Design a protein around this ligand. Structure first.
Ligand SMILES: O=C(NC1CC1)c1ccc(N2CCN(S(=O)(=O)c3ccc(OC(F)(F)F)cc3)[C@@H](C(=O)NCc3ccc(OC(F)(F)F)cc3)C2)nn1
Ligand SMILES: O=C(O)/C=C/c1ccc(NC(=O)C2(NC(=O)c3ccc4c(C5CCCCC5)c5n(c4c3)CC(=O)Nc3ccccc3-5)CCCC2)cc1
Length: 531
């Protein structure tokens, strides 16, 4: 089946990515899919369904779903926006009830979807060329609330039950490294790899989507929720008509929509199922998987250099057979630092006590360039804040991002003002003064005392700074001492940031003891819609 069918009415809009590049993206994402399912696929699927049986999901109220709407979610064509929804206005609510009643009445009529080009910031790099704008398909604000009513409890309960430890989103960055490192140590002869699927969303066949539904149907579901899942599957999930920003009929989808509630959850389940089955086809001994949507890391017992090269080809053959071919073929790695997943890679450093600590790190180029864009054109989303949270132990986040933004915030007297940030699915509102507490909860106390980084990691940061015209780490060290000083003078929460966050900047280091606030770390108390 053709992933996409196009009419000719072009993708109209509302370095960066424009709608002018969309034509190239369309070509990459449009293709025929050929699925050849085998007995392993069926066996894994029965195992998964059995684990889903145990889940019981609650149907959310019309009002309950409104308070989970992100404040920046696109407005409805029916005259009401995200604000109107979370304020529980009669226009929003009465219209949402009609959408809900329509899902329970209509079982065939496809739900209309909007095709858009994602405006992302990438780096102006003269190996490879400019990437074309990613495509984003989504239903109306109204349908998006009903999706949450019928499936919010499912998606935020089910994957963890079906996949257990293989489910990526359950982990904090510290917990993810803990998992990866333990699984690598657990093997007597470790050999891992990361499998990148070319255009994941486009490889998701109508059967794949119906297979996910078959899994959601294994929970205890309210009759209404059960019907709504059935209707949302056939009217939205399995495909539908596309409509550009203007209002013209753009084309027809027969794959995954990125702007749906099930996207993340479903992708994880689909990728897990395919990979898990392909592990049996390739006869990969003592397997460990870590699935983060379309992202997949496999750790196992090596069976020899030649044998592993062969087993990896068998894995790929099997994945391709399940309509999930690779971008570039996976190579077996015998060092965990070389395996790249969720754009990041495990690195090592030493804390105060001299103990070797593992941490996740990525190439600073994109985070830095994105932050430099944020600095210029004003945005409601702060990639830098996310990056400071997610990559807190890294040399780059600590020395550049933290130094830069804290000096900016100190100067604007905005340290006490909350900021909206998106970490993968979830949207949070965090005050920078609260960061130490969060960083400790997500990474550990070692996050503030790290030193003795890998020479290569140090050079990756160094060379990257030169390339972007960013002042050297020596400049940053100096700048940090001034921020640290100005923070400690302020006292209270401001002084905690100075003490913990900026300890690396001083010659005369302080004894960093566990934070009095992070002792009773709640989390999800910063949570403002998702997931
Ligand atoms: O799509 C989702 N669900 C659909 C399928 C059903 C979904 C999406 C996100 C999500 N979460 C909760 C767990 N965490 S979390 O880290 O505990 C955290 C908690 C609070 C916080 O904000 C604060 F603290 F400020 F409140 C900030 C972080 C975040 C995360 O994305 N984790 C994965 C991950 C972890 C490490 C990685 O590695 C590297 F670091 F390299 F990226 C890469 C991915 C956010 N949960 N579910
Ligand atoms: O050799 C020595 O001993 C010292 C050398 C030295 C060299 C250059 C400076 N530069 C500066 O002071 C100024 N810019 C900066 O001090 C600066 C700060 C952050 C910058 C960033 C990012 C850093 C991460 C958060 C967002 C801002 C970028 N660029 C930056 C420049 C360079 C830039 O202009 N743009 C980009 C573009 C892409 C990526 C990064 C950048 C301030 C006004 C005049 C220029 C300072 C010291």
């Amino acid at each position: 089946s053709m992933s996409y069918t196009w009419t000719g009415a072009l993708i109209t809009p509302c370095y960066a990515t424009t709608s002018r590049s969309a034509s190239l993206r369309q070509k990459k994402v449009t293709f025929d899919r050929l699925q050849v399912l085998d007995d392993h696929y069926r066996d894994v699927l029965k195992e998964m369904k059995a684990k889903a049986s145990t889940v019981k999901a609650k149907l959310l109220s019309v009002e309950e779903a409104c308070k989970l709407t992100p404040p920046h979610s696109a407005r409805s064509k029916f005259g009401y926006g995200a604000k109107d929804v979370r304020n529980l206005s009669s226009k929003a609510v009465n219209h949402i009830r009609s959408v809900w009643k329509d899902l329970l009445e209509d079982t065939e009529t496809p739900i209309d979807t909007t095709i858009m080009a994602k405006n992302e910031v990438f780096c102006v790099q003269p190996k490879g060329g400019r990437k074309p704008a990613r495509l984003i398909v989504f239903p109306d604000l109204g349908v998006r609330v009903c999706e949450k009513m019928a499936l919010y409890d499912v998606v935020s309960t089910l994957p963890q039950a079906v996949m257990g430890s293989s489910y990526g989103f359950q982990y904090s960055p510290g917990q993810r490294v803990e998992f990866l490192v333990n699984a690598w140590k657990a093997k007597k002869c470790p050999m891992g790899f990361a499998y990148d699927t070319r255009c994941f969303d486009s490889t998701v066949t109508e059967n794949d989507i119906r297979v996910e539904e078959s899994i959601y149907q294994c929970c205890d579901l309210a009759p209404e929720a059960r019907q709504a899942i059935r209707s949302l599957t056939e009217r939205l999930y399995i495909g539908g008509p596309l409509t550009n920003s203007k209002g013209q009929n753009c084309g027809y989808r027969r794959c995954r929509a990125s702007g749906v509630l099930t996207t993340s959850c479903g992708n994880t389940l689909t990728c897990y199922l395919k990979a898990a089955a392909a592990c049996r086809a390739a006869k990969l001994q003592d397997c460990t998987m870590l699935v983060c949507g379309d992202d997949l890391v496999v750790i196992c017992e090596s069976a020899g250099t030649q044998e592993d090269e062969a087993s990896l080809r068998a894995f790929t053959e099997a994945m391709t057979r399940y309509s999930a071919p690779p971008g570039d073929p996976p190579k077996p790695e015998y060092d965990l630092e070389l395996i790249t997943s969720c754009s990041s890679n495990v690195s090592v450093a030493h804390d105060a006590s001299g103990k070797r600590v593992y941490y996740l790190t990525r190439d600073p180029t994109t985070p830095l360039a994105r932050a430099a864009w944020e600095t210029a054109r004003h945005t409601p989303v702060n990639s830098w804040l996310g990056n400071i949270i997610m990559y807190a132990p890294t040399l780059w986040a600590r020395m550049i991002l933290m130094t830069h933004f804290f000096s900016i915030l100190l100067a604007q007297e905005q340290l006490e003002k909350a900021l909206d940030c998106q970490i993968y699915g979830a949207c949070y509102s965090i005050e920078p003064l609260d960061l130490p507490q969060i960083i400790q909860r997500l990474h550990g106390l070692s996050a503030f005392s790290l030193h003795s980084y890998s020479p290569g990691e140090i050079n990756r940061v160094a060379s990257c700074l030169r390339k972007l015209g960013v002042p050297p780490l020596r400049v940053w060290r100096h700048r940090a001492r001034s921020v640290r000083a100005r923070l400690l003078s302020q006292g209270g929460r401001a002084a905690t940031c100075g003490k913990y966050l900026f300890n690396w900047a001083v010659r005369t280091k302080l004894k960093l003891t566990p934070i009095p606030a992070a002792s009773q770390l709640d989390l999800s108390s910063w949570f403002v819609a998702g997931y």
